Amino acid sequence: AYTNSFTRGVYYPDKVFRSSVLHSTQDLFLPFFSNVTWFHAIHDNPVLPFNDGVYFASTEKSNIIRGWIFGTTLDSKTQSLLIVNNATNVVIKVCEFQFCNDPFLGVNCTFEYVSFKNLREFVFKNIDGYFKIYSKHTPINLVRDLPQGFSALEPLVDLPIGINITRFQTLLALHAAYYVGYLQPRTFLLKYNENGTITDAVDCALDPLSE
Amino acid sequence: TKCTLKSFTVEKGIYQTSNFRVQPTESIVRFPNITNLCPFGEVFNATRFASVYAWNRKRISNCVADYSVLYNSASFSTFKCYGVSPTKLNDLCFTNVYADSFVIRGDEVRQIAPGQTGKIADYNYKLPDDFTGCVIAWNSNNLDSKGNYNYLYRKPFERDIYFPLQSYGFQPTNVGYQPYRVVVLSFELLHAPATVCGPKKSTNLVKNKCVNFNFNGLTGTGVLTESNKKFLPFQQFGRDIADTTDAVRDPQTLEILDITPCSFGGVSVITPGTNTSNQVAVLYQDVNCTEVNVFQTRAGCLIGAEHVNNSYECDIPIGAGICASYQTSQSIIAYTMSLGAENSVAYSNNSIAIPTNFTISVTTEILPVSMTKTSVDCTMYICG
Amino acid sequence: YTMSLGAENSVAYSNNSIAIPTNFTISVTTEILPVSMTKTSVDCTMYICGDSTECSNLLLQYGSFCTQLNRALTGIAVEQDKNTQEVFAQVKQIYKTPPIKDFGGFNFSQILPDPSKPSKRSFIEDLLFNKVTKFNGLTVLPPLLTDEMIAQYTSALLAGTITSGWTFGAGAALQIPFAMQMAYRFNGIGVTQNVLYENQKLIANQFNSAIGKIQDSLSSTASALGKLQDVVNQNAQALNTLVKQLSSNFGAISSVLNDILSRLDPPEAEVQIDRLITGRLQSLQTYVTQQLIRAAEIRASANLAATKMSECVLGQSKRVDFCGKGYHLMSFPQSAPHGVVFLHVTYVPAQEKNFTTAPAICHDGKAHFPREGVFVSNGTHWFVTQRNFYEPQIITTDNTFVSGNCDVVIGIVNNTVYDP
Amino acid sequence: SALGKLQDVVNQNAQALNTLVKQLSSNFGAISSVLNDILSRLDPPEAEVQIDRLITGRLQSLQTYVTQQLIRAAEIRASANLAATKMSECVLGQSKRVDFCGKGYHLMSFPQSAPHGVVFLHVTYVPAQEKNFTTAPAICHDGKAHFP
Amino acid sequence: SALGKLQDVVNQNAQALNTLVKQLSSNFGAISSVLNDILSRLDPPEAEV
Ligand SMILES: *[C@@H]1O[C@H](CO)[C@@H](O[C@@H]2O[C@H](CO)[C@@H](O)[C@H](O)[C@H]2NC(C)=O)[C@H](O)[C@H]1NC(C)=O
Ligand SMILES: *[C@@H]1O[C@H](CO)[C@@H](O[C@@H]2O[C@H](CO)[C@@H](O)[C@H](O)[C@H]2NC(C)=O)[C@H](O)[C@H]1NC(C)=O
Ligand SMILES: *[C@@H]1O[C@H](CO)[C@@H](O[C@@H]2O[C@H](CO)[C@@H](O)[C@H](O)[C@H]2NC(C)=O)[C@H](O)[C@H]1NC(C)=O
Ligand SMILES: *[C@@H]1O[C@H](CO)[C@@H](O[C@@H]2O[C@H](CO)[C@@H](O)[C@H](O)[C@H]2NC(C)=O)[C@H](O)[C@H]1NC(C)=O
Ligand SMILES: *[C@@H]1O[C@H](CO)[C@@H](O)[C@H](O)[C@H]1NC(C)=O
Ligand SMILES: *[C@@H]1O[C@H](CO)[C@@H](O)[C@H](O)[C@H]1NC(C)=O
Ligand SMILES: *[C@@H]1O[C@H](CO)[C@@H](O)[C@H](O)[C@H]1NC(C)=O
Ligand SMILES: *[C@@H]1O[C@H](CO)[C@@H](O)[C@H](O)[C@H]1NC(C)=O
Ligand SMILES: *[C@@H]1O[C@H](CO)[C@@H](O)[C@H](O)[C@H]1NC(C)=O
Ligand SMILES: *[C@@H]1O[C@H](CO)[C@@H](O)[C@H](O)[C@H]1NC(C)=O
Ligand SMILES: *[C@@H]1O[C@H](CO)[C@@H](O)[C@H](O)[C@H]1NC(C)=O
Ligand SMILES: *[C@@H]1O[C@H](CO)[C@@H](O)[C@H](O)[C@H]1NC(C)=O
Ligand SMILES: *[C@@H]1O[C@H](CO)[C@@H](O)[C@H](O)[C@H]1NC(C)=O
């Protein structure tokens, strides 16, 4: 099952404030109007390749999707970044955790940190061993597919894990469909408003008009 | 004016000679107030270093790095820095520091450098061609030598965990084959939250005054004011179109400061010919009469010229309708240029004016027709 | 599609047929000419090496590159004021219109200055001004003549024209009724002044309607102001490119001179600063060369505008299409941002009729030729009429002159020449 | 100061040549501005680098000079065309164009040679002394309008 | 030769294009005028120079 990414997947590329200016950047973005593999959480969590970066989005009504797993083997044989959001605590671990055959939650550690109606988007990528997470929480009223609109993603987490990542997996809390994209080194023209919020973007390789 | 014209006689007119520039009063140095000392001790005084095939990469962050003791220490056989100068490490400071500790044979030290190739620079440890940091090596023939066969050799910064793996024997009787403890300090200079900064004391910040600032190694001169720009929590620096820094966040107090360059502008000297007088009037272009017989014009601040209500024909143009001249006791005067005498025409619907006379007038018009036919021998000019 | 060159129009030509207009229309056209451009000045030392003693000392090794660029930009800036002065200051006195606007039915309140404004500019001038719109050593010098002074010069030219014809441009201003001035102009285009003195009301109404249509065009079309806005756009793009060139590396480790200085000792700080200096100096030289090339063009346009002012406003031009399509009557200058706008009032024939013509006429064996105008026939009777307006008159010995005999002229016809 | 642009051209050309000559004393980063001094002090491997710096600097200076000369030559060509037009339409004939041949009504012109230029003596007719009169567009004699 | 400046413009433009094309064969101090030859013989550290 596929769907259209529309204009989703736009995030702030650097940590420099700009206002009322059109800035062109060369960074791993999600292509506009691309196909994002669609999965269901009804009545479905393969291990997905990581490639060069991942765009992850989900629509939630009861907080079913709460965690992610990153690694290469995911069987305690190699360091695996693990994120869990239980109750009101955000937990991140890098331990070589031993994973089950079908890992899900019921309803040499070198780092550790402990802190439809909702659309949650996430971006995961590794550059030079740096694990960055960009996210944006916005309310929606739609269940069929990802809503159409533009909303930039800001970074919240920057981990120097240094892990070689090739595959990842999603954690489901079983007693919310999710979409997975991929990033490419595409050229974008970002429109910063007066307040410095990226309100519009142009995908330079989308069509001759955008060219 | 005389020096600018390369002449001892100055013709009548207005000349642009120098540039006015406000100077800073005091210097501001600002760093996060972290008293932790960076654990270079556990890296440089470690009991045993790892092998070159599996060199250890230690993260150094959230501490003060004193590079002066390392530089002055005489135990070091070589200390080569490629990205930054060793004497600037105390002022400059970095987001993160990587220290790669491993042991290299005597002849292979030269291979640990950007742009180098060989059996070491390409196989068991590769450095980027744009590497920014320092390579530190000292002899360890009195600590690591035995035979010591625990050290083995086999993309940049790659840890590669008839075999392609070989080992050498370390003996005290082997210089070019003796064990060298070589550690590579790698720095990242991306503009980001800084956690490793040198032992320089911060000072109090002064606002609304031309100061020479220093924010986490980002230096410059300007006036610091409170700004209403909403930096996001991950944002540290602001930038303008010309890539220069426009706003900063104080690392000690989470507030945003607007940086505006200190006042500057061209300086124009309005003078009659030195054949007539040595008195001059100075125009400070496009500045107010604050940072500099003071007359304020739209062309700048005019000093030395007396403003006069009477309007005359323009003699020495200034700008925005103001002209200057040398007029009576004599001095330089400033006035608005006169476009000519007003002449109302006695028009009516049945009146005509007809000339009863005439005059023959001969005028002169000069037109360039040609210029000098120069020719330059390019070969002889460049390489005579 | 293939573009069309225009509608095809076959001309009904024959050896004895002539078409003469019986009516006319007064048309006012608008021509916009750039006169000057922005007087920019770039501090080369501050642009290349802003507040850096080491960079300035290294730049001193390049000789007089900085000073010659400054010299070229100063020359351009002075030439701009020269262009404006040449175009507008062609009147030796500041004339002003009489307080009573009795111009025989011609309404000039549209282009005369409006006293109620804070700046005495006409309504069309305000329309023109409302349609056309850093810290790195790049400064903009103000023009010598303010917009108020330009408006005063244009008002003086307009008042002198309206009240004195071409006499103020020739010598001292000589007052003349505007109806008589228009009769002068009509005689200037080969149309008898009786035409004006008989159609004065119609001509005044046509002139007022044309001026109103100029209002409509200027208020409705943004693209009417063309090359004048194009110059502004080109200068803005040049400055933007020059500013953006400061962010380039040119091969250096960083585009920030302070960052290079704070990280490296002199031995290779000098190499990095040399790369930056080379890049920024090349950028400055490119900008200066482009500015000189464009300043030459603006100077040429300013010379054209001065020529048009002298030969079109201060006088009447016999040159075709130099002052708008048609037969030129008069022009009115208007100020525009860094330019001048001319309102060319021209005479255009409108309604034609076919007549049978003849090169000459035999009366007593002698060939009669028209003194002024041509012979026409309405089918039965022959008349002599002026070329640009149908006004037939009886063929008399006062209208024609005798030359030769009937046996030489080809196409001669028989008629009777009345003797008063 | 009567002769203006004509002397201005000479000044500009002389200043351009002076700047081009003075550019030979610059280093452009080389150890010495003297090519003979560089040659007599260094072996070819480094003399090549020093001479490369000097060549780059001097070649760029020549290009700047030539570009300035082309731009100025275009202006001089335009002025020469203006002078030819004035000669043809003002000396060889009588001009009806206003202010093309001096202020007033043009009568005749006389050409005079000038250093790298031409000087025109425009003889013009200028009305001097005026009087106010009462005018009328036409006159009735027998019901018919008479026009001059 | 009746057509003068008109043919002169064509000649000048052709000479300008010919000079621009011939400029591609110059070394400007590089080891070779062929960019592919430089790329196929050197690693990036001096291939960039
Ligand atoms: C010449 O053309 C003008 C048009 O501009 C004619 O004037 C019009 O006359 C009609 C009556 O026949 C009026 O209704 C219009 O209002 C007039 N127009 C204007 C602008 O005043 C004029 O009659 C024509 N003359 C001849 C001899 O044909
Ligand atoms: C010339 O035309 C202008 C229109 O631009 C006339 O001014 C208008 O006059 C009427 C009175 O009939 C007023 O109601 C308008 O407000 C005026 N408009 C403006 C813009 O002022 C002017 O009266 C005309 N001149 C003559 C002598 O009739
Ligand atoms: C050609 O013009 C003549 C002169 O105007 C015309 O002759 C007159 O015609 C009018 C009719 O409108 C009569 O009232 C006059 O008495 C005629 N006068 C003379 C002297 O003939 C003639 O009709 C015109 N012919 C054509 C074909 O237009
Ligand atoms: C104009 O009138 C003259 C007479 O005044 C005509 O001349 C006649 O020409 C014919 C043919 O050549 C001769 O047979 C006659 O003898 C001529 N008349 C006289 C009185 O000698 C002439 O043909 C007329 N032209 C036109 C075009 O009608
Ligand atoms: C996306 O998938 C649809 C099928 O649902 C297909 O028609 C379309 O070509 C695909 N687009 C891309 C870019 O893969
Ligand atoms: C910027 O933020 C302020 C909040 O004080 C808000 O009032 C304003 O509308 C915002 N402007 C834009 C362009 O979003
Ligand atoms: C290592 O120890 C020596 C003394 O044995 C000391 O002088 C040196 O400073 C230490 N290294 C560092 C990085 O401090
Ligand atoms: C600097 O000191 C102040 C107290 O004066 C403190 O609030 C602030 O957190 C310190 N900065 C850092 C980075 O800890
Ligand atoms: C100069 O500063 C004063 C305030 O002291 C201000 O009123 C004035 O507008 C300023 N003028 C200019 C040209 O900056
Ligand atoms: C001009 O005159 C006014 C009033 O007469 C006076 O206030 C003003 O100071 C005068 N200007 C100068 C420069 O003297
Ligand atoms: C004159 O006759 C031709 C014949 O075809 C006709 O086309 C033309 O319209 C006529 N002239 C006028 C003014 O009607
Ligand atoms: C004009 O041309 C016609 C042919 O259409 C011819 O019959 C007549 O004789 C010619 N007239 C003259 C004067 O050439
Ligand atoms: C004509 O009358 C006006 C009325 O003021 C006067 O100013 C003018 O001087 C008179 N003309 C001459 C030539 O004197």
Q: Say how far apart CA B220 and CA B210 lie, in whole Å.
A: 11
In chain E, after which residues does the backbone break, taking C–N over 2.5 angstroms as a break? Answer: none
Q: Angle CA(B109)–CA(B110)–CA(B114) in degrees, nearest 5?
A: 115
Pairing of strands B281-285, B300-303: antiparallel
CA dihedral sign of residues B306, B308, B312, B313 = positive
Q: Say how far apart CA B324 and CA B316 lie, in whole Å.
A: 5
CB contact (8 A) between residue E44 and residue B117: no
* Ligand closest in space to the Cα of A181: 5
Chain D positions touching B370 (Cβ under 8 A) are 76, 80, 116-117
Which of the residues B343, B351, B358, B363 would you substitute to probe the C interface, choosing the one with the greatest number of C C-beta atoms within 10 Å?
B343
Q: Say how far apart CA B166 and CA B178 lie, in whole Å.
A: 16
Q: How far is C193 from chain D (nearest CA, A)?
A: 8
Residue of C nearest to D99 (CA): C310
By what method was this entry solved?
A: cryo-EM
CB contact (8 A) between residue D121 and residue B362: yes
Q: Which of B57, B234, B241 lies at the smallest CB-CB distance from A154?
A: B234
Q: How far is B203 from chain D (nearest CA, A)?
A: 39
Q: Say how far apart CA A27 and CA E32 lie, in whole Å.
A: 34
DSSP helix/strand/coil, C80: helix
**Residue B112 DSSP symbol:** S
Element (H, E) at D8: helix D5-22
| Alpha-carbon torsion angle C74, C78, C79, C82, nearest 10 | 180
For chains C and A, tell me whether 3 or more CB atom pairs sit within 8 A of each other: no
In sequence order, the 6+-apart residues with CB closer than 8 A to the CB of B356 are D129, D130, D131
Nearest atom within ligand 2 for CA of residue C212: 5
Residues 60-119 of D with CB under 8 A from B: 62, 65, 69, 72-73, 76, 79-80, 82-83, 86, 102-104, 107, 114, 116-119
Pocket test for ligand 11, best of C354, C355, C376 (most atoms within 8 A of CB): C354
| Alpha-carbon torsion angle C294, C296, C297, C301, nearest 10 | 140
> Tokens representing C356?
């049978």
| Alpha-carbon torsion angle C250, C254, C259, C262, nearest 10 | -90
* Residue identifier of the C-alpha nearest atom 7 of ligand 11: C12
Subunits close to B (at least 3 CB pairs below 8 A): A, C, D, E
Using a 6 Å CB cutoff, which residues line ligand 4?
C 362, 413-414
Chain C positions touching D57 (Cβ under 8 A) are 62
Q: How would you label C212-228 residue by residue, b for 16+ Cβ within 10 Å and e otherwise?
A: eebeeebeeeeebbeeb
Sort residue C174 into left (φ over 0), alpha (ψ -120 to 50) or beta: beta
Query: Which value in Å is the resolution of this experimental model?
Result: 3.4
**Contact present, B331 and B306 (Cβ < 8 Å):** yes
Q: Which whole-number Å values give the CA distances from C270 to B131, C266, D46, in the listed order?
A: 19, 6, 18
Query: How many angstroms separate the alpha carbon of residue C285 from the centre of ligand 8?
Result: 49
CB contact (8 A) between residue C175 and residue B242: no
CATH 2.60.120.960 for domain A2-211, yes or no, is yes
Q: Is the CB of C13 under 6 A from ligand 12?
A: no
* Ligand closest in space to the Cα of B35: 8
**Contact present, B15 and B4 (Cβ < 8 Å):** yes
Among C277, C280, C375, C341, CA closest to C42: C280
DSSP B2-71: HHHHTSS---SEEEEEEEEE---SSB--B-----PBP--HHHHS-S-PPPSTT-EEEEE-SEE--HHHHH
DSSP C60-79: GGGTTHHHHHHHHHHHHHHH
Phi/psi for E37 (5° steps) reads -65, -40
Q: Which of C180, C194, C318 lies at the smallest CB-CB distance from D135?
A: C180
Q: Is the CB of B343 under 6 A from ligand 10?
A: no
Query: How many angstroms separate the alpha carbon of residue C361 from the centre of ligand 11?
Result: 25
Nearest atom within ligand 10 for CA of residue B307: 13
Q: Angle CA(C181)–CA(C183)–CA(C189) in degrees, nearest 5?
A: 110
Query: How many angstroms separate the alpha carbon of residue C178 from the centre of ligand 1?
Result: 22
Residue found by looking up tokens 């960039």 in the block: E48
* Ligand closest in space to the Cα of A194: 6
Which of the residues A17, A78, A135, A158 would you substitute to probe the B interface, choosing the one with the greatest number of B C-beta atoms within 10 Å?
A17
CB contact (8 A) between residue D119 and residue B366: yes
Q: Is the CB of C411 under 6 A from ligand 12?
A: yes
Query: How many angstroms separate the alpha carbon of residue C329 from the centre of ligand 13?
Result: 28
* Residue identifier of the C-alpha nearest atom 10 of ligand 11: C354
Q: What is the CA radius of gyration of chain C?
A: 31
Q: How far is B35 from chain A (nearest CA, A)?
A: 23
In sequence order, the 6+-apart residues with CB closer than 8 A to the CB of C187 are C193
Q: Is the CB of C244 under 6 A from ligand 11?
A: no
Q: Which of B260, B264, B343 lies at the smallest CB-CB distance from C94?
A: B343
Q: Say how far apart CA B162 and CA B168 lie, in whole Å.
A: 16
Amino acid identity at B171 = Q
Subunits close to C (at least 3 CB pairs below 8 A): B, D
Helix D44-86 crosses helix D5-22 at what angle (to 10 degrees)? 170
Among B272, B209, B266, B222, CA closest to B248: B222
Among C371, C361, C376, CA closest to C401: C371
Chain B positions touching A154 (Cβ under 8 A) are 232, 234
Chain B positions touching A16 (Cβ under 8 A) are 191, 235, 237-239
Nearest atom within ligand 8 for CA of residue B253: 8
Chain E positions touching B114 (Cβ under 8 A) are 45
**Contact present, C246 and C137 (Cβ < 8 Å):** no
Q: Say how far apart CA B383 and CA A30 lie, in whole Å.
A: 57
> Tokens representing A30?
């999600």
* Ligand closest in space to the Cα of B62: 8
Q: Say how far apart CA C94 and CA C173 lie, in whole Å.
A: 11
Q: Say how far apart CA C315 and CA D106 lie, in whole Å.
A: 13
Domain boundaries, chain A: 2-211
* Residue identifier of the C-alpha nearest atom 10 of ligand 8: B252
Q: How far is D79 from chain B (nearest CA, A)?
A: 6
* Ligand closest in space to the Cα of B346: 13
Q: Is the CB of C393 under 6 A from ligand 3?
A: no
Beta bridge partners of B25: none
Q: How far is B123 from chain C (nearest CA, A)?
A: 27
Residue of B nearest to E43 (CA): B115
Residue C275, number of CB atoms within 10 A of its CB: 15
In chain D, after which residues does the backbone break, taking C–N over 2.5 angstroms as a break? Answer: none
Q: Angle CA(C34)–CA(C39)–CA(C40) in degrees, nearest 5?
A: 130
Q: Say how far apart CA A116 and CA A197 lie, in whole Å.
A: 26
DSSP B333-358: EEEEPP---EEE----TTEEEEES-E
Q: Say how far apart CA C197 and CA B322 lie, in whole Å.
A: 48
Chain B positions touching C93 (Cβ under 8 A) are 340-343
Q: How far is E48 from chain B (nearest CA, A)?
A: 11
Q: Is the CB of C381 under 6 A from ligand 3?
A: yes
**Contact present, C62 and D26 (Cβ < 8 Å):** yes
Q: Angle CA(D28)–CA(D32)–CA(D36) in degrees, nearest 5?
A: 120
Residues 286-305 of C with CB under 8 A from B: none
